[PDB]
Design a protein around this ligand. Structure first.
Ligand SMILES: NC(=O)c1ccc[n+]([C@@H]2O[C@H](COP(=O)([O-])OP(=O)(O)OC[C@H]3O[C@@H](n4cnc5c(N)ncnc54)[C@H](O)[C@@H]3O)[C@@H](O)[C@H]2O)c1
Ligand SMILES: NC(=O)c1ccc[n+]([C@@H]2O[C@H](COP(=O)([O-])OP(=O)(O)OC[C@H]3O[C@@H](n4cnc5c(N)ncnc54)[C@H](O)[C@@H]3O)[C@@H](O)[C@H]2O)c1
Ligand SMILES: NC(=O)c1ccc[n+]([C@@H]2O[C@H](COP(=O)([O-])OP(=O)(O)OC[C@H]3O[C@@H](n4cnc5c(N)ncnc54)[C@H](O)[C@@H]3O)[C@@H](O)[C@H]2O)c1
Ligand SMILES: NC(=O)c1ccc[n+]([C@@H]2O[C@H](COP(=O)([O-])OP(=O)(O)OC[C@H]3O[C@@H](n4cnc5c(N)ncnc54)[C@H](O)[C@@H]3O)[C@@H](O)[C@H]2O)c1
Ligand SMILES: [Cu+2]
Ligand SMILES: [Cu+2]
Ligand SMILES: [Cu+2]
Ligand SMILES: [Cu+2]
Lengths: 338, 22, 338, 338, 338, 22, 23, 23
């Protein structure tokens, strides 16, 4: 009826997750511990005050080794080495791996060694051994005993895969490319500074910075059919949150723009309900802050060049939207704990 | 990976090493 | 050997043009007058100091009715109605229409009525009657007596058309779509304010703002072959200058990425020399400020999905680059004055 | 009683003012009309979707010439000339003059000549015959028959005065200077463009822009004793909302940092309750979006140089905080009509 | 004579310092080595392409472990521990300590224990035994044998002191307070993230962020007479470079605004020639990118409240202006080696 | 174009009317 | 400083070139 | 205020969580 969860990496996703969880009516989870590179004070403070989310409307307190939010206390640890975490003794079933540093089964496994039973990486799994799931796309194929280390993919993949599915199941994708105009993230530098990636090294708030992404391919993990068909790039721009994907795919079954949006719109209220949102209003990025859906199709922008060439634009709150999907995945595993 | 290969291996969370797949 | 030019609208393009002109070694033009919604003082000041271009290294002075730069004096007028401008008496041959308000032959013609012999609109011509030229794409088809009202198209068209040409002349474009991640411009509001376009009404420096564009089609005016084949959208982002186009076209002659860049690279040093720049460095937008070329291909980003699906990314300094092309067009007309 | 109110200028203060109203306990006002440079469709869209405030949670619709919010319909007029407004025929008692244009006693009066019985200028009033009131400072000196045109002063004055008062009563200000690090506003150009004020002419989101201000000298209008004592400047920086003022006053009664903070805190809990907020947390500007108070003293920043040179730092949500005061001032006038 | 110099920390001040050098008349220094947390390829790319300074016009190349600029090759070391640097074996006379980490007299000394004969800290030195010098203020008190570890103080101190001096000599400062509206720097997080300082923890490009500063109190290190007289704070705002300080000093000899400006202007032309720039134009922050002087007085902003309360506003290119002073200080030490 | 049609026709350079084809 | 803006702003008080908010 | 940052920043003076520049 309930699994104990620990959060490793109390960053953007780690804190967005905790807030998405507290905001829900019912849950089969219980967040009982957090590991981070900070003290409990810093943790409580960044959770309560957020430049993007605004102040967290909740009763938040803290002490040397814990923070408390609306009656629930969570132990605060600060060990960079997962192998030293007291997961076994704290009876931790699921660990949210959101440090962005343990994305391989090998690294994530360190939590299992420490005593955790399962680890859910909030990023694309690196190397072999991890099971990737995207709610609303292949969440139905979830088996508790399949992988001790799972992944909720990347935020782009979560916005892309759900749209690509409806597009493949209705028009059949022959192939396509994709560009995501993304908000800058913590892996970029505020000012021109040293970095293993010469583009990520440039001042993020004053440049349009291109970066290679795996999101396009990653869709192939939740939609095998598309294996090797999609591809893309990323353009980071001066906004702190909310991104948008530009998907151009060569359909197999020639159609028209009105049909494409008719399909997408149908999904938003049926199959992809809660995952895909259908927007037909002249809106902008900030309007989508706090949007729970994973993909927000801007209908007025859909293009069908010559019956078979389709172009779709979908927004997504890379932090909040994605984090609702992490809560979803965690909840799934909770409802199917073995 | 002359420098960053070995360096980022010991400090994968260093400002010069973070790479978030977006 | 020389035509007298007047600048109508001393805005971003109007001032970038004047600076591009002063920066050249030789010219068949002589800028002798400027009309604007300001006084001579404001004109001299904004020309000298620029948030994007930096200080104009030149001897600039002014008085009640004129500004002087490096010995050349230019009369300063301030009449919003072109029909009242003393073009005839000031022996004005060419007028740079850069107010952004007279884009139809009808409106631009008001300068002819006022006595000017030719008008070059720094934007896509609206309605029938204007001749559109894009240096390096169809500048060879220029006839002085063809149109008294010409157009240098839009900045996107100038970056797009030159690339689409090389792509059509080498692989043959069957069709395609395009998205331009553009810097915000003066038609957008700094904060959420009233506007005939609900998206352009939103705070430009904190939003990703989509807008419909004609650039995609406009290419058909300089490359008839592509008539009705290309199409696109625009995403304005929080940067004050420099944009980048994302072109995805279905080639007719299957190829590979290395070939596509091999072609583009060839053009940069031959046919499209001075128009297209070939960049194979991990750069970002600010790096392209002050770049004279019209299209700056980022090779490392070129994609060829399944032999026939090509995706190209090209940067462009929408203000400076485009303005060099306006100077070019003006110079052409000067060298062929009838 | 329920006086009838009309809004002239449905911009930032205009729409913010409304939302403050629609969210209050009880009301002695009734907004029945809104004059703006736009159609009802635009006015409805902007009141709902906001880049700063976020989506307006309310039932909103509109028709050919009016908007309805939570059952309340308000007529939408679109005349740039106050003299031509249907104030008389619409039995309008009070006009909220928030266009930013009719701020002189002479221009505001045009609403009176059109039928309105009283006009409230949401900015400093220039000229003679205007009653300026700062809630919590001199609002008790309000008399319905004292002035037909009243002013709520500027947002900086609304932050400056409440604090200047407590510091004067308690320590008596001899002289003083101030500087406000303000968010940019709609009077500034998004990119270098013509402006009567060469500093307001510069790209707003990429510059720190100094501007003269009459907020310091205006404090004298509500605290007569300070007349000729305070002066300062303003620096607009790249943030869309929320500002902070830096006050440095020479006091007569020497004190220490803790004393200054103790009284400011005392007032925030007593006399200045609801007007001056006391903050001892290490927060940043975005944490104050939505703060109702007018002055939010940042206690850890208070400083007292050599017993008599006091420096206080106070944040203020220039759009939302100020609007609450405008709704406060309108209520005062409603509770004292005749 | 030509002393041998090594750069520890090739960041903003690091690379800016170099470019200032490579662009000077004659030199008594010779940069032979650069220690940075990166490979030579990265160090070469960042010295050339700059988001703020723009492309470095110079011949630049690099090899497996060094970079050559205009014929001059400099060795590239990559050791985070100063104790392990080849200073002794490379006959390094002076080290430019610009890592931002070894700023204590104790940490800087590690360069000495490694062989360097002298170390110049490009920031305020903490601890005992450090010689602080502000060019144009107390640089004539320089003596090679006075200190092995010297400091060029902070960029704000370099703007504050030169002005505090002229205002003290001429009017004698009794007491004073200051506030600097500074561009964000690499010590701040791009998005809300863990930091020992809760304010530096907040998203830099979307917040006005207050921080404590020892720039005001540090002025006492170069103008002993001011010790215990000046204090202030700092406010980091969303601009990548260029700052402005707001000084409010109580003077002994009452004066008027014109007098304060007349002396500041006098000095800018005489004693403070090359250090304090006098500006009477209505400019904005970006207009000062590249200004060599340390203090750029904005005369139209000068104010004198009641004869003895003076307020001066001075701009400073915190990266480039400060670097010129670091190159100035290194030259002084080179011209006085032994 | 209820309002902006007629309005933008007389003040085509008004803040609410500018549309630059980008 | 009104060789133009005086009249222009008098006649077009809401023009982008004329707006002055007392921040 | 050093229940963590004291040691951490002592051992990792260049960490993103430790940088303090005297602006
Ligand atoms: N838009 C987004 O931010 C987004 C969306 C989807 C997925 N992700 C993914 O989530 C991960 C984290 O991203 P983020 O945006 O939250 O970044 P972030 O930097 O804010 O979060 C990382 C957090 O982990 C902590 N941390 C780092 N190393 C640690 C260690 N060894 N032990 C304990 N804590 C440690 C940091 O102190 C920080 O609090 C990445 O893999 C990223 O790609 C991010
Ligand atoms: N990136 C770009 O800025 C860019 C690139 C290519 C083309 N363009 C095009 O150029 C035109 C102007 O763009 P901009 O960026 O220079 O904008 P801008 O607003 O800076 O320039 C317009 C100028 O015209 C003046 N003006 C307006 N109405 C006038 C009138 N009736 N009489 C005299 N002067 C008048 C204004 O005062 C201003 O100085 C537009 O059509 C635009 O689409 C812009
Ligand atoms: N931080 C703040 O925004 C702030 C705080 C306090 C006071 N104010 C004051 O409020 C006033 C407006 O500022 P704002 O921020 O709301 O700007 P804004 O531009 O968003 O609002 C002005 C509104 O007036 C409309 N308008 C212009 N001319 C008009 C006319 N002739 N008839 C009818 N409507 C017209 C505009 O279309 C717009 O909707 C200014 O005087 C300003 O100084 C602003
Ligand atoms: N406006 C300014 O930027 C400014 C002005 C005056 C003084 N400063 C001072 O200069 C110092 C650096 O600031 P910055 O702006 O150049 O920041 P920065 O981060 O760009 O530069 C610091 C550099 O040091 C390197 N580094 C870090 N740890 C190292 C180690 N152990 N060994 C070798 N290299 C290492 C980094 O990789 C980086 O290249 C600070 O103390 C700062 O206060 C900055
Ligand atoms: Cu993503
Ligand atoms: Cu364009
Ligand atoms: Cu204000
Ligand atoms: Cu400084």
């Amino acid at each position: 009826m309930t699994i104990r969860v620990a959060i490793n990496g109390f960053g953007r996703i780690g804190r967005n997750f905790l807030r998405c969880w507290f905001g829900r009516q019912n849950t089969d989870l219980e967040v009982v511990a957090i590991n981070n590179t900070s003290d409990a004070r810093t943790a409580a403070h960044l959770l309560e005050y957020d430049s993007v989310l605004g102040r967290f409307n909740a009763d938040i307190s803290y002490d040397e080794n814990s923070i408390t939010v609306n009656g629930k206390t969570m132990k605060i640890v600060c060990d960079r080495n997962p192998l030293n975490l007291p997961w076994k003794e704290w009876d931790i079933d699921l660990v949210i791996e959101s440090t962005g540093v343990f994305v391989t089964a090998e690294g994530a496994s360190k939590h299992i060694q420490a005593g955790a039973k399962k680890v859910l990486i909030t990023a694309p799994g690196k190397g072999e051994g991890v099971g990737t799931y995207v709610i609303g796309v292949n969440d139905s194929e979830y088996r508790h005993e399949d992988f001790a280390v799972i992944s909720n993919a990347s935020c782009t993949t979560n916005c892309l895969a759900p749209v690509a599915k409806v597009l493949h199941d209705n028009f059949g994708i022959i192939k396509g490319t994709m560009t995501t105009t993304h908000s800058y993230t913590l892996d970029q530098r505020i000012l021109d500074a040293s970095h293993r990636d010469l583009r990520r090294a440039r001042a993020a708030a004053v440049n349009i910075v291109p970066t290679t992404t795996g999101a396009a391919k990653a869709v192939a993990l939740v939609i095998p059919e598309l294996k090797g068909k999609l591809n893309g790039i990323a353009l980071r721009v001066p906004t702190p949150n909310v991104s948008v994907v530009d998907l151009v795919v060569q359909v197999e079954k020639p159609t028209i723009t009105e049909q494409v949006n008719e399909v997408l719109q149908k999904a938003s209220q049926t199959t992809m309900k809660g995952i895909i949102k259908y927007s037909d209003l002249p809106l902008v990025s900030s309007d989508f802050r706090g949007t729970d859906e994973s993909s927000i199709v801007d209908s007025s922008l859909t293009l069908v060049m010559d019956g078979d060439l389709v172009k779709v634009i979908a927004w997504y709150d890379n932090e909040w939207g994605y984090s609702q999907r992490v809560v979803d995945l965690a909840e799934l595993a909770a409802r199917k704990w073995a | 990976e002359p420098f960053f290969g070995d360096y980022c291996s010991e400090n994968p969370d260093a400002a010069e090493c973070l790479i978030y797949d977006d």
